Paper text:
Here we describe a systematic approach to generating modular and rigid repeat protein oligomers with coincident C2 to C8 and superhelical symmetry axes that can be readily extended by repeat propagation. Repeat proteins are composed of an asymmetric structural motif that is concatenated several times in tandem within a single protein chain. From these building blocks, we demonstrate that a wide range of unbounded fibres can be systematically designed by introducing hydrophilic surface patches that force staggering of the monomers; the geometry of such fibres can be precisely tuned by varying the number of repeat units in the monomer and the placement of the hydrophilic patches. All multiplexes follow the naming convention CsHRN_Rr where s is the cyclic symmetry, HR stands for helical repeat, R is the number of repeats in a single chain and N is an index to differentiate between multiplexes of the same symmetry.
Author numbering:
A (entry chain B), B (entry chain B), C (entry chain B): 3 to 229
The structure:
Amino acid sequence: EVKKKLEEVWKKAKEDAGDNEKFLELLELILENPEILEILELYVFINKEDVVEKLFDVIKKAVEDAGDNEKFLELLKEMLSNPEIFEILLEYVYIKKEDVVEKLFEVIKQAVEDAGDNPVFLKLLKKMISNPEIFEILLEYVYIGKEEVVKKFFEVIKQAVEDAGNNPIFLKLLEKIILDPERFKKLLEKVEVGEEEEVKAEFKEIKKAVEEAGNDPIKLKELEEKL
Amino acid sequence: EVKKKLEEVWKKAKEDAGDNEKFLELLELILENPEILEILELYVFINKEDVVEKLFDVIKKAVEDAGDNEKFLELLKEMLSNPEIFEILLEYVYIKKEDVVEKLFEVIKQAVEDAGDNPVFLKLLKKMISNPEIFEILLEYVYIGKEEVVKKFFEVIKQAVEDAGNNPIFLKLLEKIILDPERFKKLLEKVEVGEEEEVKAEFKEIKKAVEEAGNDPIKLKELEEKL
Amino acid sequence: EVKKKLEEVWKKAKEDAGDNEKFLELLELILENPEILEILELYVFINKEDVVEKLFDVIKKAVEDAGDNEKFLELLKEMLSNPEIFEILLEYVYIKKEDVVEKLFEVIKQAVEDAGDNPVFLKLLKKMISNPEIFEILLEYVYIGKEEVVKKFFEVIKQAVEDAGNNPIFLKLLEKIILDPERFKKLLEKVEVGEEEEVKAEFKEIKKAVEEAGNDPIKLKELEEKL
């Protein structure tokens, strides 16, 4: 029965959307992934199916909204390929929060449109929206309504990447600071209270420390220890 | 020399078992996996070979006992593909505990026969028998002789999956509770003392809490924090 | 622009080194790996390129020095395939420490030449030089000048593998002791002070404990707990 339920859901949304080539090529990535296909098969035996049918429509209305934004489509492929990110979306549809997901799906599109050929910020964007704890935190900040603070933190990160002097040492350190979910929420907390410039005041502090030690790999190891 | 020793072990057990197609198709999965083939090559230079020869016979007598139980053969492929599970088996043969492995190999077959088209319990079964710490705990409970408590815990989990109301939130929470090896042994400890119904009394407590909060993703985050 | 910068760097070093087949077949492994190719693309947008150009010359002068040492070329493939090891090398070139990398690249070649058909020590060598924390510690010990203590620890490990009696239990325990970066530096600290024989005195202590418990999987679990 589970094989018939899924292939019906496949042929249904496939036939209903033929003009959307970006959703057709993305739906097959979902089927070819045995880990996330295993989630769909467990969700039809659990008598959801509509939860899977609603998640397809959210991403179908997502690839249609962005349209020919290729730097956002590859994000969705990285997100929908992650079995935990794909499953926390299915759990944000059984809870009936398809709107909270759609909002977050668009604030990252705005960060991509604002990126403007900044592949270092794109890698940081992929790296945090693929972390289950960070991705849940971003959804939990949008359901409350504090959606612009996510845009505000995304901008402070985008500007901190530019305020690096092309120094790969500080960019790697900036990665290890924001990816840690404990420090990620602390920086979101300071942006939500108004310290959007004081959080940046510490990024310059760390960048100055990187340039102070500089070409000494031992002097830099202590800086990574000082966190 | 190591290449000749292995291909001799290959052609030996291959020729001695031709009527067993399930062991022939499974032996090639072992050879095609470079990680676990690297374990076999280190075990012939270490002058075991018989340890590898005895492990093949255990799984050969395992695919023969289950026979055409396809829901158990895919388990063995998931277990024998894991390089740490495959290696902790080779270490339970040098210790001369090929019997303790055979018992555990059959209690999971009984959980599969008792499953009866319950793919959610099959995913939980794969998820815990692939954890090295959990797999060692299951072997260590059988060597003592307490083998039915493993069957007893497997049944309480199988029934807790059914006692979910098709709620994907509680099934994901039930997964994160039993996969943690520290909580896994605590639930095995309470089943070994007789509290087979009191452990279930807490599963209803958590399921009631899931339905209490329900469609609120913030109210559910605290429930996952209350562990 | 980033696509043109890289293919220029590719065709440059490719044309300048045609007699070195080992560097040509290794350079294509770097390009075929999307994770580490993503690092190179972020390093040309960051206006390095020379950092990538210098890293290629370090490994080109590495495959040329070792020559037809196949047991060292497969090491470099395992190291250069790791996206974090490959990136911590790019950060040891922007710091202008291409010499500290070249030294460590040769002390592992000496451990391979001294290995002499000891595949258990080769697996331990791959396992620790692929750990980012351990690999950074090995670089940080060479930049100071304490390079022979790395050779000294590599020899004590190579001899501890032989002093195992072909016991797979103690070899797995010896693996879990040295791979832990906290214990890895403690053993390097005791070798740097002169206790090259006292660290070995504890390896016999653990091996004697393995043979004492022996064929009891419960008595051995406590030994792994006693760390």
